[PDB]
């Protein structure tokens, strides 16, 4: 089926957009010290899966990465624990700087796939 390409590439576009938004949010919150209720910011990631044989890619869910918080010592802070160690986001920088580029490249590649498929479908529309 050549119609399924549209909702395969749309799924790919949506998944890559979600991944790029997650990476941008992590980069923005790379240094945020607290949330709305004292909960430290946690790096988040998306889960990709196949639609199903094989099909498009769907984002199953968004999960906070389970890594120890890079806690720092600020005793004169209300959020400090009993030992004065406040918790900071466990977000690197190279990871997101590469995730953005990879997501953009995949997005552009799927755009090219959709363009080619649409062109050949329109060409087939005038058989004979």
């Amino acid at each position: 089926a050549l119609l399924n390409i549209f909702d395969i590439a749309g799924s790919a576009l949506a998944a890559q957009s979600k991944r790029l938004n997650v990476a941008a949010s992590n980069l923005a919150n790379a240094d945020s010290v607290t949330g709305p209720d004292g909960q430290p910011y946690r790096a988040k990631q998306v889960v990709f899966q196949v639609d199903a044989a094989t099909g498009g890619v769907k984002v199953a869910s968004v999960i906070e990465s389970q890594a120890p918080e890079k806690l720092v010592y600020e005793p004169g802070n209300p959020l400090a624990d009993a030992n004065g160690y406040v918790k900071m986001p466990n977000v690197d920088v190279v990871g997101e700087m590469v995730n953005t580029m990879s997501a953009s490249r995949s997005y552009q590649a799927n755009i090219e796939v959709l363009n080619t498929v649409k062109s050949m479908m329109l060409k087939t529309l005038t058989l004979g």
């Binding site: 749309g10 949506a14 709305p36 209720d37």
Partner: peptide
């Protein structure tokens, strides 16, 4: 329910409070 589908119920507004009251 699944994102991208069609549902006759409009989504509730999105809000981003700075601090929980």
């Amino acid at each position: 329910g699944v994102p991208g589908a069609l549902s006759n119920q409009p989504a509730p507004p999105n809000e981003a409070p700075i601090a929980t009251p």
